[PDB]
Each structure stands twice: as structure tokens, then as C-alpha cells.
Amino acid sequence: ADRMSKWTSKRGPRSFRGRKGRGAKGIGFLTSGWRFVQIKEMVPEFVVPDLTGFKLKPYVSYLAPESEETPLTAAQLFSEAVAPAIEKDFKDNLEKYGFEPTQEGKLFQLYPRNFLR
Amino acid sequence: GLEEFFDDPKNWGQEKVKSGAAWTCQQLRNKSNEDLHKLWYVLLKERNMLLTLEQEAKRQRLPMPSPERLDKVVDSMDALDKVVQEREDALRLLQTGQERARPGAWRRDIFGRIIWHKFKQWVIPWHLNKRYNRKRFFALPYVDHFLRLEREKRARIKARKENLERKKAKILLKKF
Amino acid sequence: GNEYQPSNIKRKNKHGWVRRLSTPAGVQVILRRMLKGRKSLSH
Amino acid sequence: FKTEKEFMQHARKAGLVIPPEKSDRSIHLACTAGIFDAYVPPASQVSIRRIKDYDANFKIKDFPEKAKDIFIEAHLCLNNSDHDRLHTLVTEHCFPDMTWDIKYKTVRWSFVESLEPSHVVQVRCNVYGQITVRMHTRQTLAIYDRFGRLMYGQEDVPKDVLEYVVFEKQLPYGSWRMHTKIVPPWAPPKQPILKTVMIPGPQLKPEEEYE
Amino acid sequence: LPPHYRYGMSPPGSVADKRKNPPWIRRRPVVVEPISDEDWYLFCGDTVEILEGKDAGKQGKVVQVIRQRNWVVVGGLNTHYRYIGKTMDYRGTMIPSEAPLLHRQVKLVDPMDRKPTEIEWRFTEAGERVRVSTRSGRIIPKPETWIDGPKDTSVEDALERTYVPCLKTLQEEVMEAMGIKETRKYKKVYWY
Amino acid sequence: IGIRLTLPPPKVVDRWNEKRAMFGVYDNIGILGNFEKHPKELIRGPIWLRGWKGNELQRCIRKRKMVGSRMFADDLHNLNKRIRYLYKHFNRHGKFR
Amino acid sequence: ARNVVYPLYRLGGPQLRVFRTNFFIQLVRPGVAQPEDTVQFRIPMEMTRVDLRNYLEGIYNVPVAAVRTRVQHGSNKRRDHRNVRIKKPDYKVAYVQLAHGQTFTFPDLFPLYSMLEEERQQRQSSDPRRGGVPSWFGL
RNA sequence: GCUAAACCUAGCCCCAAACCCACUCCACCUUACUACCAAACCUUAGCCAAACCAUUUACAUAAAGUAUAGGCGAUAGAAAUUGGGCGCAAUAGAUAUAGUACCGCAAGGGAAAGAUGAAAAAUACCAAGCAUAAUAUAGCAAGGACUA
RNA sequence: GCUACCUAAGAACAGAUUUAUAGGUAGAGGCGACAAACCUA
RNA sequence: CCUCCGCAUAAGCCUGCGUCAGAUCACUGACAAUUAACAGCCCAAUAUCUACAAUCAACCAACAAGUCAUUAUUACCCUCACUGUCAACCCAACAGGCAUGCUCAUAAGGAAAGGUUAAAAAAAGUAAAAGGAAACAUCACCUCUAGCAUCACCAGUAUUAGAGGCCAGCUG
Ligand SMILES: [Mg+2]
Ligand SMILES: [Mg+2]
Ligand SMILES: [Mg+2]
Ligand SMILES: [Mg+2]
Ligand SMILES: [Mg+2]
Ligand SMILES: [Mg+2]
Ligand SMILES: [Mg+2]
Ligand SMILES: [Mg+2]
Ligand SMILES: [Mg+2]
Ligand SMILES: [Mg+2]
Ligand SMILES: [Mg+2]
């Protein structure tokens, strides 16, 4: 008879409690005989680097200076990333310089995303 | 191993731990993407350390040794994640020109109001998606009266706030 | 007074958001709850 | 409770986690927890230099005269209960120890002429000057009650008082104020009291005995 | 913190505050006058002079600035006396606690004249804005080590510009650097 | 005991305020400024009662026809019900007829 | 990661890979008696059993062998001053059995007052023989 | 002398002016708050007035309550043309401290209440009701009185 | 979500039975082994 | 001394006699718990198959006629996730109700009496001399209507369908 309480998975009859879950993601699918097939590719692999010899600790010493916030606009990233190659190849087909018109052939597409985070 | 959930065993019970500053954003904009990946896992393991130390602090009914470095680690994870999103966004503006990573459209539900609808991934196209076509992104004409009623409720709240600000200003000029 | 004999299937099927939005009159029920200001528009 | 350990153990057993929070303002004390060097009564020009380098207009040959007027005037502030002058005349280690038990009763202290000249005894030393003075006076007391009936001392009759009064100065706007009053262990007992006292023995629960 | 929360001498989240301002009180809010952020000119550590009440004329030092009530705690001045450490049967100790001061009641002090001077925010060639007194053109300045632990970056490693700005993703660059090679091509889904 | 124990804070009234010292100016702008404005064009207020006096039913009728198209929805509804009530009251109820 | 849209997998597609992990983790002490090789965590709600296995394997190099999770309902039975229910948040609990015969025991974490304490030693409570008379005076 | 009393200021109301809102991330029409598979419009009616009821019955200024209509009765009714506060101040003012608590299966109904001070890093006297202080022949409880 | 009838697929101890679950019928209506009964006191 | 109760699942409820602490016939705050094998959560198409109840299923015995099934070709190779899991509990009342499986007096669950006295009246129980009462529905029947098919009647067809009527004995 509650309305204020959140409708969680703990709350219905058996048929209700089995369907609704928490925010977990589906990993595979059910098959006949209710047999869950887990798909290896849907499980996220945590790509975790090697931390050996790595010189960045979680905190910064207080002796480091203060700097000014300059967010990375696309004009800046165009300037440093693209602008020397265009100044060099103009003093002497835009896809040469790191541009792609489409990205349907691309693995990590930027719009809409296919990578995670 | 599991001893990476706990800090240096010399610090246990010392009730004060000298920790450095947090990472600000401009210190992190000088780091490469591989280095921000690795720093994400440094701060990640440190954050799990501090969260075990909080939950054991509440368990033993004791106060934290230094609760500030949890704020610093959340501060640095926030700054680092914001830097990585800045580089994804600027590259998205160059390569495609979009502003949202996820597509959507301004739609207008049963309730008349205009909503940014975030698109979901599907396999089948929308016209034979049986559940998508039960959603109504149109408002019928019995809703426009309630749109007018809602409009006027917001205009009442705004008028009350603005008038009340002027009354406070008059009290300030009578007092000073 | 034991007129209320509870179940969640009858509660969601009777008064839930899906049955409220299934008709135009129920959509007007939701809109009046949204305009009175209420915290629960439905079950 | 009775201490801080009892409250923190009760706050640990209860679950009251009180976080020690960092505040930039602290307590700006103007006193000392007691005496720097306990003058035990029957070469300290070091501390006289360490006073004159801050104050620079300070004659000890005039000070037990001043220490008389800091003493006597402070005691007359008990005759009226004028606490706002006492905070100029007396330190805050000394203010409760002279005004707390005297509350809700009238005192009628008075001074009459000293037997001896008052003379300074020793001087010691963010910086706290501390000067102990010997005074050998004749004073009169009458401590009354809430009901105005005498509970200590005949009002007319002067009594001879030894007073090893310790003064203290902050070393910007402060001055010399009475900090404490040493009473030596050889000193005779004070005036007896007009009333009688019962002093209880051990309250015995039934399981124990008196032995 | 609720609306019309009353500020006080205690910090806004301490234990004494939660004794004084529990979440269900509603009190008459203090009509403080609006001092803009550009126009607040008393800082923690300024030697000031008290104009009204007890300790008038005395020159102290600002310890805490409670800016929401236009307050100045001159440390060591404007004192009353409170006990602390009062147990069940010990009367505590007498301590000179400090009552705050409104910014109207306090003026600043020239460091060469030691006088109560009006302060205007003039501008300078060297610094865009700094305080300047009125009875003289004198700049009264704004007043007031570390060993690293095992988990601090030194200033050297914290400031190495290791970032070569390129047109690759963090994802693509980590896939190249970690040596992960992905042969399966991604298959186009519908978004709606 | 609904009576106050301490007498209230004093009512400081400035009779030589800007508004009080200049009250009433330009009430005779018609009769000694060559009739170029009427004094009813000096009053500020609701647009349906600048220079008009009526009883309540007439203020409601005039409010409805002069501003009623841009009134809020339930204010317009309350006002139509007030005209409907005040109609049924002035016209059918009373002592003198 | 959590609060992230996952990309849809179609059959034959690439491996789903997470490069910066959004969800944290905290290992708590067991509130009951548990076996020697079981380590109890507080997983956040969206973290599955498989994500936790690969999470501890990748990041912490812990040889995880079994994982069993229970979702804990926090109480919605405590109210404000406003008679409005506060909910203590629900949380998922991971019970991890470590491999290779290893064994985890939760470590023993957590093994101006001069002025106050130096007047608490000079208290000098009143003599009962003094009968209430203030002993400040030299008479 | 307990219970209590008091208290100004949250906010609100009426104008004027001005045309408002609405994508951190995620989820939200399936059992809303759930990552993912094969169709909209169609006279308002009645209450009430006519002392019943049955046709009928209102939804800038000026012409003008004029022409008209009308069981020619109740009543309805043109047009040409003309041109900030002598507000409220906590039973008030908003229902609002909140569309919450609570009540209802649901639509829906819908509360109550706060007051220190500059600093809390300073802990009086007055409603009814009683109590101090039970009662003494006899009676709308008073009045004339009276040394009482 | 009571109650009246019905439906689906059940159960129990002998039926014109009792019953759990989910669905249907709605007020100018419904429903009725018709009491002008009942239809969330 | 009671036990016509219990224990589990279902539905419901949603942390509601766990530990620590505290205030209050004599709840608040902190912390901790319920771990999946049981139970939910299923199924690749396109065609095509599915006359012979259950009842110990055997005879018998029936009518009201019944609760259970594949094959052909094509596609198909990964695998154990997610959710429920606590309690002294729900709907009411300020008496009652509640589905199912086991146990059929219990191995499980509990306590009718705050203390006293033993007045009246009232309630309940036991004993008592002698006497021994001092209308609708519906089988069946009749009447009327209806010659017919894809949403009731009805996947029915006038043997149908619908509407009507009918003494002795004991006992406060
Ligand atoms: Mg489970
Ligand atoms: Mg009539
Ligand atoms: Mg006209
Ligand atoms: Mg009100
Ligand atoms: Mg109200
Ligand atoms: Mg009274
Ligand atoms: Mg199973
Ligand atoms: Mg169980
Ligand atoms: Mg038992
Ligand atoms: Mg009894
Ligand atoms: Mg008998």
C-alpha cells in the first residue's frame, strides 16, 4: 500500500521479484530449459596497465605551484595537433593529417560512442 | 594482493596522516593519456584503501585518522575524469562536430513538455520495435490546458520570488 | 473492515503508470497529480 | 561523568563519533596553570632583564607599593561584588578561586595598616612575568550568609595575615594582576568556624561491614 | 545547511552547532548589510582598532572572519569570561572568550601611523587592486615547511609535460600502448 | 491573555520624507496648466481602475473586459464565479426595493 | 563502469573493454564468523559477480575462486523531525573465496590540555572541616 | 507558583513592469524510474431565476440599458457613430515549514507548528485550570445591609 | 484487492460444494437460485 | 498447567524483541546481517502432426465427455549471470479473517492468576431435596418467437436456441 517507497526488486510476488533487478548489465541471454548462456564478449575486460616504475603517486606535494585553468577547446587541439602539419604542407585530401570524414570503419567511434567511459 | 586495500602498517592508529595536495586540473592537462590511465588506477586503488578505512572507522566506532584525503582523492578522480572528458569532447568537435556523446532528440511526451530524449541502442529499426511504438511522443489537445496551468504556476512562483527580493531590499534600506 | 486484501499485481495492474497512461482520462489523472504537486503520481 | 575518558568511552560504546575539526581560531589565554617556580618560603635578575626588555619602564623599588594597591583594591571589590573591576585587577586563574565560594553571601573585608612594609620576593618568566610578593598585613573579615548571619570572623577585630601573593603579567595591554596566593605548609590553621560540622563515615551497602 | 541558517561563532557543521542549530529550528534571520566581495577589506591577521564598547581604542589582530554576519573576531579584545571543562563536580576554568565585532565597529591601522584610517581600494600598476589608506597614500598589504610523504609526487614528476597533443582517443592510445590488438570490427547498431 | 507585555518598538515616522513632502503635487495640473492633462492621468494602479470608481460587481465586470483576456486561468475562473455570485446577490437579495 | 551506457554487442563483434573503472569497492570485516578464505566486500549495486572476479584479478592480483553476493536492504524505518522516512542506502555484499589455499584475516586497524589537566591536579576540593567558608582569604 | 503567557519575521496577497521554463552522467509509457529483437477531433449539460414549471434565464468612455428580442414575463440586449501598498503578520496572509504527515483501493481529500541574545567558543506581574488554602443549617447564590 | 456473477488455469473434501490466484462487467450503469439485495463501513 | 496448535511455502509486509548505548504496569542512535543448488527469470524459423479420459486403470462401470505428445528441413557451439532469501510479520479490530504441504498431540509452540479480600448485583460452569412444563430457482410439462453461419447465442441449426408460466420420559 506504499507509494513513497521505491519499487525495488525485493517487493513483488515471485514473478515480479525475478524480473526486476538492480542496475546490473546483461552478460548473456537465457536459452531453453532456462539455461543462461554467458557471452564472453559482453563481459567488460578491465584494461589495467603496468604500474612498475611509475612515478605518479596519488597526491601532489604542496611545493608545486599554482597554475591557471585553460580547458582544452577544439581550437587549441586543432592548433597544436594539426597546425604544424598544415603549416609545413602549405609552405611546400584533408585525411592526411589525422582527420576522418566518417568513422563507420573505425573501432572507437566518437559519435555515437562504442567505447566505455 | 589484499594488503593493497590497507595502507602502510606503520600508519595504523596514528590518527593523522600527512598527505599532499590533490591534483588540480591544469597539473593533469600536462599528462599524456597513457599516464592518465595509469594515474586513474593509482587513485582508484587509493580510493578503495580509504573507503575500507572509513567503513572500518565506522565499525570500530572511532573517528577517521584523516578524512581529508578521501576528499582529495575524490577531488582528483573528478579532475582527472573531467580532463579525459575534455579531450574526448574536443576530439569529438573536431572529428564530427557533435556536442553530446550520446544521441538524442528534443521530443514532446504525453505530458506536453519538451524533453531531451536520449536515444538507446537497439538492433531492429524503430518501425518494427514493438515496445518503442507504444511510447507516445505527441501530446493530444487535452494537455494544452494543463500546459497553460503549469505555465501559470511557474509564473506565480517567479513573481513571488522577485517581489520578495524587493521587500528584503526595502528592509535593508530601512535598516541601513 | 478488511476490505483491502493486498496484492501487488492488482495494485500495479489497477493503478499503475501503464494503466494510467493507457487511456486519455488516466493521462489527465497524471496531469492533475503533477499539477497539484504530488510526490507519487501513481503506483 | 567525571572525566574526558569516561565521555569518550561512553561515546565509543554509544556510537557518537565526534570528529576533531580543524579551526584556525584557538583560545587566547592570558594566564598560567599555576606557578612557574613554586616559591617555598622560610639571583633572578635574569627574569628582570627578561621583563625590562619588553616593558622598559619598570622599577621594582616602586612595585610592592603597586602590589599593595592591586591587592587591597581587589579585595574591596568583594565588598560590593564588582566583578568587572576584578577582571582588571586579578587574573583568570585567580578570579574563580576567590569569587566562586563567596557567591550568595556577603563579605565585609577591610584593610588596616600593615605591620611590615610589603616587599617583593622573587621574579620569574607568549611571555608571562610572575612576581611573588610578601605582605604582612592586618585585615578584618566578616563572611555572612544568604540570611545575613555571621559565619566567619568578628567584624571589628584585626588579624595579622601573611600573604605570599603571586602576580602575573602578559608580556600589549595587560598589567600586573594577582595570579595566586602561596600558603606555606608550616602556616598555622585559620580562624575556627562559628558552627559545627558532622563528617559522615562510609555509607555501607548491606554486603559490606565497618572495620 | 537549511535556509535562514543562523551563523555563529562555531563553524557551520561542528558538534556545538548541531546542539545550537538543530535542523528543525526557525529563527528571525539577522539583517546583515550587503558587503560585496570586492568591498570586504578586513582580512585574517590585520591589526585593527575597536571603536565602540569595551576595549574601545585598543588595537588588536583579526583572528577569524565570519563573513556571513560581517564579523571580525579581534583576538584578545572584546572579551567576556566563560568556563570550560566543567564536569559534574568540578567548576571548570575561567577563560577569556571573545565576542565578535561588526565591521562598522572596527577600523584598520596604518603601519607607520598606528591610527584608525578609512581604507579605499585604489588600483596600482604593479598589482591590479590593493588597499590604500586615506590619511596617507599608503598601501596596507594583505598579511599571512613541507617534506613529502611516501605517497606524494615530487614537483619534478608532477610538472613533466608528458602530453603530446594528438588526434587519438585515450582508448585508441591505450590500445596501442598496451599492445592490445582487436580484429573484430564493430557492427553498426540503431539509435532511437 | 492576548495582550502584549512589553510595549512595541517605536514607530519612527518621517513627515518630511520625499513622498510626504511632495504629496499632492500636480493635483491641479489641469486647472493651472492649461488643461493639457487631467488629474486622473496622474494616478497609477491597475489599468482597469485608473480614473474610475465602481462597486465590486462593476470592478469585476470592468476587470474582466479590460484585462480579462490575459488574466491567469483560475483567476479568470474565480472572477467569473465572483461576477456570477455578485450578480445573483445584488439583483435578487437585499432589504430595499 | 557504472552509470555508463554500455555499447550493444552483436554476434561477432569486438570485446567490450572498460579502460577507466567507475565503480569503487571496499572490503569490510565480516559481522559474523566466516571461513578463513572468505573476504567480504561491499560491491556497488551494479557490479556483477563476473565484474568483481575480473576486478580483483586485474587490479589487485588476487586469485579469486568463488564469489557469492547478497543485496542488503537498508532500513526505510527512521524518520526526520518531519515524519518523513530516511532510507539508509541499499548495498550489495560480495563474499569472495580466495584460491590456492590462501587465507585472509582482517587486520587490526586502529590498534591547552596542559592548562586544564594542570588545574585538575590543583583542584583542592573544600574541606568538610571548613563548613562552606571560602578558603581564599588569609584569615 | 505550576500550567502557561507574551513576542517579529518567515513568508504571503494585491498591482506594475516584463512574454517563462526545461539534456552533469544513468534510468524513466513493460509492473514508470527497467541497457538490448518482427492511434486525435463529434453542440456541454444542468444548478439556479421565473416565487411551480414545461419556451426562456447574464458568463476605456459614450450612444444606452436606447433600438431590439421575450411563456412580449422572468429577463436578455446591440450597432452605426465617438475616442509600489490608509495589504496581512503565524487561527492572518498562500493549503503550504508541505501538496509533505495522515486518510483513501483509487480518483481524491489534506494537516499542524517558530519566537533568547551583540555573542550560547557567554546556559517577573496577567486567561481558564489547579496549588498555597476542603467543608458548616437555607436554597439562580446575589442585593439591602451590618460591628461582623 | 470487499461483494455479485462470469472467464482462464488450479486445488481441496463429493456437490446446484468450498476455495486460492489472475482477468471481465461501472452508476441513465452493472450484477442478481429477485432480497428493488449487493456494487471498498 | 495449556496446546484447535505448530513448522514451512504462498500472498502480504519491508528491517519491525540481532549486538552496543540511551531515554521511556515496570522507541531513539550506531553497527551488523539474508551468500543458490530451492524459487523466479526461458525457448530459432517455416510447414506438418496431436480419434482412443482420470479414477492403484486391470476387469467392470459410466456420463456431465475430460488436465498433459511431435515430425520434416534449415540455422545453431558459447556456457552457470541477474533477482528473492531477515523478523516476534499480513488484513483488520481497537472481535475476527487468511491459500497450501506435512505433524494429527506434538520432537513444536506457549501462560488462563499485579497483590489481597471473598460483600451485593451481573456473566459463565458445576451440584441440587420432593415435584417434573406447574419467496425464488429448478428437473418435468405447456405456450410463444426464431429457417440461420465467422465478437455472444454459436464455431450451435427446430429432439435446436431464446423468452415466459407452474403420549411416555427427562430437565433450576
Ligand atoms: Mg542470490
Ligand atoms: Mg423557478
Ligand atoms: Mg462601437
Ligand atoms: Mg496559516
Ligand atoms: Mg493551513
Ligand atoms: Mg489564573
Ligand atoms: Mg534451479
Ligand atoms: Mg525463510
Ligand atoms: Mg515447546
Ligand atoms: Mg486482579
Ligand atoms: Mg431438583
From Swiss-Prot, chain B:
GO terms for cellular component: mitochondrial inner membrane; mitochondrial large ribosomal subunit; mitochondrion. Its main location: mitochondrion. GO terms for biological process: mitochondrial translation. Transmembrane segments: none annotated. One of its GO terms (molecular function) is structural constituent of ribosome. The keyword Metal-binding does not apply. Coiled coil: none annotated. The modification N6-acetyllysine is found at K82. It comes from the Eukaryota. It is found in: Mitochondrion. Keywords: Acetylation, Mitochondrion, Ribonucleoprotein, Ribosomal protein, Transit peptide. Belongs to the universal ribosomal protein uL29 family. Component of the mitochondrial large ribosomal subunit (mt-LSU). Mature mammalian 55S mitochondrial ribosomes consist of a small (28S) and a large (39S) subunit. The 28S small subunit contains a 12S ribosomal RNA (12S mt-rRNA) and 30 different proteins. The 39S large subunit contains a 16S rRNA (16S mt-rRNA), a copy of mitochondrial valine transfer RNA (mt-tRNA(Val)), which plays an integral structural role, and 52 different proteins. This is Large ribosomal subunit protein uL29m. It comes from Homo sapiens (Human). The chain holds residues 63 to 238 of 250 of the full protein.
Curated annotation (Swiss-Prot), chain D:
One of its GO terms (cellular component) is mitochondrial large ribosomal subunit. Keywords: Mitochondrion, Ribonucleoprotein, Ribosomal protein, Transit peptide. GO terms for molecular function: RNA binding; structural constituent of ribosome. It is found in: Mitochondrion. GO terms for biological process: mitochondrial translation. It comes from the Eukaryota. Component of the mitochondrial large ribosomal subunit (mt-LSU). Within the mitochondrial ribosomes, required to direct the nascent polypeptide toward the tunnel exit and position the exit at a distance from the membrane surface. Component of the mitochondrial large ribosomal subunit (mt-LSU). Mature mammalian 55S mitochondrial ribosomes consist of a small (28S) and a large (39S) subunit. The 28S small subunit contains a 12S ribosomal RNA (12S mt-rRNA) and 30 different proteins. The 39S large subunit contains a 16S rRNA (16S mt-rRNA), a copy of mitochondrial valine transfer RNA (mt-tRNA(Val)), which plays an integral structural role, and 52 different proteins. Belongs to the mitochondrion-specific ribosomal protein mL45 family. This is Large ribosomal subunit protein mL45. The gene is MRPL45.
Curated annotation (Swiss-Prot), chain E:
NCBIfam families: rplX_bact (TIGR01079). The keyword Phosphoprotein applies. Belongs to the universal ribosomal protein uL24 family. It comes from Homo sapiens (Human). One of its GO terms (molecular function) is RNA binding. Disulfide bonds: none annotated. It is found in: Mitochondrion. Component of the mitochondrial large ribosomal subunit (mt-LSU). Mature mammalian 55S mitochondrial ribosomes consist of a small (28S) and a large (39S) subunit. The 28S small subunit contains a 12S ribosomal RNA (12S mt-rRNA) and 30 different proteins. The 39S large subunit contains a 16S rRNA (16S mt-rRNA), a copy of mitochondrial valine transfer RNA (mt-tRNA(Val)), which plays an integral structural role, and 52 different proteins. Keywords: Mitochondrion, Phosphoprotein, Ribonucleoprotein, Ribosomal protein, Transit peptide. The keyword Cell membrane does not apply. Residues 42-75 form the KOW domain. One of its GO terms (biological process) is mitochondrial translation. Signal peptide: none annotated. InterPro entries: KOW (IPR005824), Rib_uL2_dom2 (IPR014722), Ribosomal_uL24 (IPR003256), Ribosomal_uL24_CS (IPR005825), Ribosomal_uL24_KOW (IPR041988), Translation_prot_SH3-like_sf (IPR008991). GO terms for cellular component: mitochondrial inner membrane; mitochondrial large ribosomal subunit; mitochondrion. This is Large ribosomal subunit protein uL24m.
Swiss-Prot record, chain F:
One of its GO terms (molecular function) is structural constituent of ribosome. GO terms for biological process: mitochondrial translation; translation. Its main location: mitochondrion. The keyword Ubl conjugation does not apply. It is found in: Mitochondrion. One of its GO terms (cellular component) is mitochondrial large ribosomal subunit. Keywords: Mitochondrion, Ribonucleoprotein, Ribosomal protein, Transit peptide. The keyword Nucleotide-binding does not apply. Coiled coil: none annotated. Component of the mitochondrial large ribosomal subunit (mt-LSU). Mature mammalian 55S mitochondrial ribosomes consist of a small (28S) and a large (39S) subunit. The 28S small subunit contains a 12S ribosomal RNA (12S mt-rRNA) and 30 different proteins. The 39S large subunit contains a 16S rRNA (16S mt-rRNA), a copy of mitochondrial valine transfer RNA (mt-tRNA(Val)), which plays an integral structural role, and 52 different proteins. Interacts with OXA1L. Belongs to the mitochondrion-specific ribosomal protein mL51 family. This is Large ribosomal subunit protein mL51. It comes from Homo sapiens (Human). The gene is MRPL51.
